């Protein structure tokens, strides 16, 4: 079912101010992933973002067309994020229905003005996804869901795609190292805040490249905590869950800073 897998950063800095070389490098890398996404001719893009938060039942984007202008509540000074995003209502609605069958209460979200998060918007803009050609099925980051449940959520959404005869591209949107800077910095001297976070970033990235799924599994929770990894690395869990728990390897298209945090573009070889 899955024909593409990607982990793109959820930070808007790469899109917003790409003249900053570190951020520009990440922008091009995400753009490249978008080409690779397109190349695989998926009918839908299975999206999970770390910034798209839910605290009750699980949320699935079910609005046919969401359009507007988002301003990031942290990074408003760097520009605006205009968005025009299609959802596969048929698939997304089927995910809402399948979720309780898999022990997770879920609802659709179809409201004009609904706050689609930064990560989904930036991934959409940079990747050329969210179009009527590459519509989205966005699953929410439920704060009460663990890595294990996130995987169940992706697997689930992959089965619904199969039921519907649809090729799928999975994108997990979120960061790595979570040590954001607490003061205003000069954008061009932004770097990973710790050498410890950087080691951890390069360590797990290497494990993702090799396809070392087994060693990845036992690294993720220690890494998630020690390197303050964006939402417990569940956006990777999303990928794993979609791929049924195995992948041949990965191509690290980009890696860099986002105000002290770590961001990376990973192209999975299935």
């Amino acid at each position: 079912t899955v024909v593409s897998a990607f982990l793109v950063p959820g930070t808007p800095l790469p899109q917003l101010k790409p003249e900053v070389p570190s951020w520009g490098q990440l922008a091009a890398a995400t753009e490249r992933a978008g080409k690779a996404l397109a190349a695989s001719r998926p009918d839908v893009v299975l999206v999970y973002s770390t910034q798209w938060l839910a605290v009750l039942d699980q949320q699935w984007l079910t609005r046919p067309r969401s359009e507007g202008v988002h301003v990031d509540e942290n990074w408003y000074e760097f520009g605006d994020l205009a968005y025009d995003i299609r959802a596969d209502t048929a698939l997304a609605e089927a995910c809402v229905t399948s979720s309780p069958l898999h022990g997770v209460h879920a609802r659709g979200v179809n409201y004009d003005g609904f706050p689609i998060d930064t990560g989904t918007i930036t991934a959409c803009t940079l990747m050329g996804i969210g179009t009527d050609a590459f519509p989205l099925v966005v699953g929410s980051n439920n704060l009460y869901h663990s890595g294990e449940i996130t995987e169940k959520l992706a697997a689930l959404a992959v089965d619904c795609a199969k039921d519907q005869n649809k090729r799928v591209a999975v994108v997990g949107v979120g960061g790595l190292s979570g040590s954001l800077f607490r003061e205003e910095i000069d954008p061009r001297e932004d770097r990973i805040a710790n050498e410890e976070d950087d080691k951890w970033n390069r360590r797990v990235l290497k494990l993702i490249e090799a396809g070392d799924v087994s060693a990845l599994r036992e690294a993720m929770p220690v890494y998630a905590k020690e390197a303050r990894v964006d939402m417990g690395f569940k956006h990777l869990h999303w990928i794993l869950g979609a791929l049924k728990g195995k992948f041949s390897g990965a191509n690290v298209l980009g890696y860099g800073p986002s105000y002290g945090s770590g961001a990376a573009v990973i192209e999975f070889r299935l």
């Binding site: 039942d57 202008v69 509540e73 000074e77 800077f181 205003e184």
Partner: protein
């Protein structure tokens, strides 16, 4: 001219309260609901109306910033605020005015006091649902200029103590900004008490038969803390605030409460309770410290 902190309100932001009120600005329609809490706000509403303030300052847990403490810095802001968790209850068209001058004074005092502060200068910025809800609830007229302050990460990213001291400094700084500009300001701590909640949504949200405390322990903490404020034991509430947070999952962790009280110099003064109620099991009290009545409101003369 003199600066004045007229009063601090504990003004929670549960969107269901505005849903139940059925204001024309709110798209979804309700059968009513959360009447107890809505009556508490009515009492708060006319208590504020009588204050005739220059400006309302609000600190919202739903504007989370990493790089210090941000301040609304654009004269006019508007848009449709949709609650991300309850979009079926809160789809609110708003239009507000920012007291840019006061916000900047707050930011400067913040900077002068060792905090990293930030002016929100982007006019397309959507003011958070938390701020919008608290404002409508206590002032549905939208006729008082406002100063929206962000809730800095510190209590969650570092810890409660380091985070709370920053809210303390921010409070002191806010006070100093009020007195230098000479504002007649009202402080709004947009915090919920115990934040344990139902993980399941009810078929019809207005169904008050499905609305009650999520936990006994949580509810008891709320009451222990409320009566404590009502006795005026401000010293004792803040002495308990860390454990209250740890065990009640209190939204006072976000910092609005420590900010407000720091700005009020922690007045050992009896608070007026307008009501307590639960929204999704979540504990919410609408409370007031009336500084003007207590002779603690005037701050000194303003600047030239």
């Amino acid at each position: 001219m003199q600066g004045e902190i007229i009063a601090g309100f504990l003004a929670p932001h549960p969107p269901h309260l505005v849903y139940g009120e059925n204001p024309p600005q709110n798209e979804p329609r309700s059968q009513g609901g959360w009447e107890v809490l809505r009556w508490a706000y009515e009492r708060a509403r006319e208590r504020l109306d009588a204050m005739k303030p220059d400006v309302l300052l609000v600190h919202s847990p739903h504007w989370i910033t990493s790089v210090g403490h941000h301040f609304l810095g654009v004269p006019e802001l508007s848009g449709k605020s949709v609650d991300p968790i309850f979009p079926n209850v809160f789809r609110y068209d708003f239009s507000l005015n920012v007291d840019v001058e006061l916000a900047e004074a707050c930011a400067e005092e913040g900077r002068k006091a060792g905090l990293v502060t930030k002016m929100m200068r982007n006019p397309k910025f959507r003011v958070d649902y938390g701020t919008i809800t608290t404002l409508h609830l206590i002032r549905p007229q939208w006729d008082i200029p406002v100063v929206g302050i962000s809730a800095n990460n510190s209590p969650y990213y570092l810890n409660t103590k380091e985070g709370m001291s920053e809210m303390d400094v921010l409070g002191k700084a806010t006070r100093e900004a009020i007195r230098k500009t000479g504002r007649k300001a009202v402080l709004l701590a947009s915090n919920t008490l115990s934040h344990w909640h139902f993980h399941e949504e009810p078929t019809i949200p207005e169904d008050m038969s499905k609305e009650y405390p999520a936990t006994m322990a949580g509810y008891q903490w709320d009451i222990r803390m409320i009566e404590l404020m009502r006795q005026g034991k401000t010293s004792e509430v803040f002495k308990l605030l860390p454990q209250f947070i740890d065990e009640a999952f209190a939204e006072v962790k976000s910092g609005a409460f420590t900010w407000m009280h720091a700005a009020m110099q922690y007045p050992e003064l009896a608070a007026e309770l307008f009501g307590y109620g639960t929204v999704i099991g979540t504990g919410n009290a609408v409370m007031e410290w009336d500084l003007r009545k207590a002779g603690l409101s005037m701050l000194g003369a303003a600047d030239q």
